[PDB]
């Protein structure tokens, strides 16, 4: 009797669910760098200029 009978009359499937997730990620990064530059320079030059005048 009652209304609930209709649920059985037409096959009714009630489905539920619940997913509860948790996630913690911890990352530690360290880095070191070492550089070294060594240069050398050398330049040499020569010039000549001759001026002759008449007046």
């Amino acid at each position: 009797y009652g209304s609930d009978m209709y649920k059985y009359i037409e096959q009714v499937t009630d489905t539920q669910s619940q997913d509860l997730g948790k996630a913690i990620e911890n990352a530690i990064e360290q880095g070191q760098t070492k550089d070294r530059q060594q240069d050398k320079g050398h330049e040499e030059y020569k010039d000549y200029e001759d001026t002759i005048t008449k007046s």
Partner: protein, 55 residues
């Protein structure tokens, strides 16, 4: 003349956790027919053994 050196250390630690639950109810008429005599079957065993059987 240029040189160099590098170094790194990356370290990650993680944790996960998932809690999934559900509940599925299927309604069938075949279950109602089998429901009928579950209570009455209790007292067929009581009547068979404990009580008198001749008027």
């Amino acid at each position: 003349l240029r040189n160099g050196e590098s170094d790194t250390k990356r370290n990650t630690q993680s944790q996960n956790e998932m809690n999934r639950t559900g509940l599925t109810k299927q309604y069938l008429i075949d279950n109602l027919q089998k429901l009928y005599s579950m209570r009455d079957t209790i007292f067929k065993t009581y009547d068979k053994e404990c009580f008198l059987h001749i008027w």
